[model samples]
Target: EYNEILEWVNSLQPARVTRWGGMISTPDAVLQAVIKRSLVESGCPASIVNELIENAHERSWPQGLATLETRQMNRRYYENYVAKRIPGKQAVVVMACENQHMGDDMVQEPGLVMIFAHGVEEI
Candidate 1:
């Protein structure tokens, strides 16, 4: 499931370009697209994607510093949600931190964080 979502997101054309000449792909946008495609490809109901994305996005940080506190808070929220609500065999909460290794910059400052949970399951 993770690989499928990754491939779908990679295939999308960025809506804009960044200063580094790379496409500007926001974590939120990537997740949105991935959920959309996954629903179609996996023969799942499209509405399921909406519900999943909404729950996922509520805990997602699209822009901010990837601070230790921020990561921990988001992880806790996701874990609690899955453990209490979602039904599954095993639940895994994955968080992706963007710009963690970015060099220091005057414009964006040294701390910029974005977190996304991937491959969550109810195990």
Candidate 2:
């Protein structure tokens, strides 16, 4: 189920989409409209529209909330952990790390570890 959903989301290239500059049309605005339209077409509850808008606003973080130091520490921890576990014979090790903050906004703790095979296609 997750693989199917991941494929669907990846199909929508979020990186390339642009945000609408108020009046003029932009790719991000177009993508947002498409997402809403698809939700409606898929018969999702109409209340979801307002719910989504409200929840979206609530998740906004303050400017410069996440500092570079925090990011570097996280990356170092990830790299060190991966290096120790990878087999010598393997050319590359692909893994997914899920972090559960436990409602703590500052400290990040690793939760799930998933090993993935290299060159495997997801469809």
Candidate 3:
């Protein structure tokens, strides 16, 4: 069921890229905040907010590159394991990648952050 839910969720693109930055990597406090805000803004129920957060899935890599295989594995783990049995109005997938030159500055390594809010409609 979670697999289907996840596939269906991914089958449909997110309403938007709620956040992105090199600093928004996995396990970062800022990324956590971004996820919460994205869910709330998408109209996710408050009661299920924690549920979604707890069930959230994330992936990170250093050196600014991600293999397609890793990406699929992350999705499967999140959809099949973490989010498999969780109940919520939506699910969020946060991704972060780091590189020596991540942003315009070209001095500070930057990571990418994207909060994909499933089951959310356009505002």
Candidate 4:
């Protein structure tokens, strides 16, 4: 089930951990490694897996994930563009968005990453 798959992904630790105030985050390099492995294990097609990985790294989708509205838009993109490509497996979407307020007198709007994962069976 989709819930189980999401849990499984959460279980896999990333190579590096960074702090986003109270939140935790890691880089694309770390996420790509584990995510690539899980997709293959899930029985997702090699070609589709490659494309998905590439898209996540490149941010191929039009939606920007900084705000609630854009994040919702990415979900729509995931549902229509990404999920459709994977076929049987349920596509899971995770976003790494920047904190609007970094520190005192500093406003940083860093680019966000959309992480997608799926599995054929429970890990």
Candidate No. with top TM-score: 4
Separately for all candidates shown, the number of backbone clashes (residues 3 or more apart, or on different chains) is: 10, 1, 3, 0
Off by over 4 Å in 4: 1-27, 64-69, 72-113, 116-123
Q: TM-score ranking from best to worst?
A: 4, 3, 1, 2
TM-score of 3: 0.32
The local distance difference test score of model 4 is 0.36
In order, candidate lDDTs are 0.30, 0.26, 0.35, 0.36
Query: In model 2, what are the clashing residue pairs, if there are any?
Result: 18-28
Worst 10 residues of 3 by lDDT: 78-87
**Top-lDDT candidate index:** 4
TM-score of 1: 0.29
User: In lDDT terms, how accurate is model 1?
Assistant: 0.30
Candidate 2, superposed: residue stretches over 4 Å from native: 1-27, 53-123
For residues 11-122, what per-residue lDDT tens digits would candidate 4 score against the true structure? 4333111111211122267666665676677564443456555545433432343344554444433222111112223223232222232221121112122343423222
RMSD of each: 15.1, 13.8, 13.0, 13.4
Scored against the true structure, residue 7 in model 3 reaches a CA lDDT of 46
What's the alpha carbon RMSD for model 2? 13.8
Predict model 2's lDDT versus the native: 0.26
Give Cα distance to truth, residue 117, candidate 1, Å. 8.7
Q: Could you tell which candidate, 1 or 3, scores higher by lDDT?
A: 3
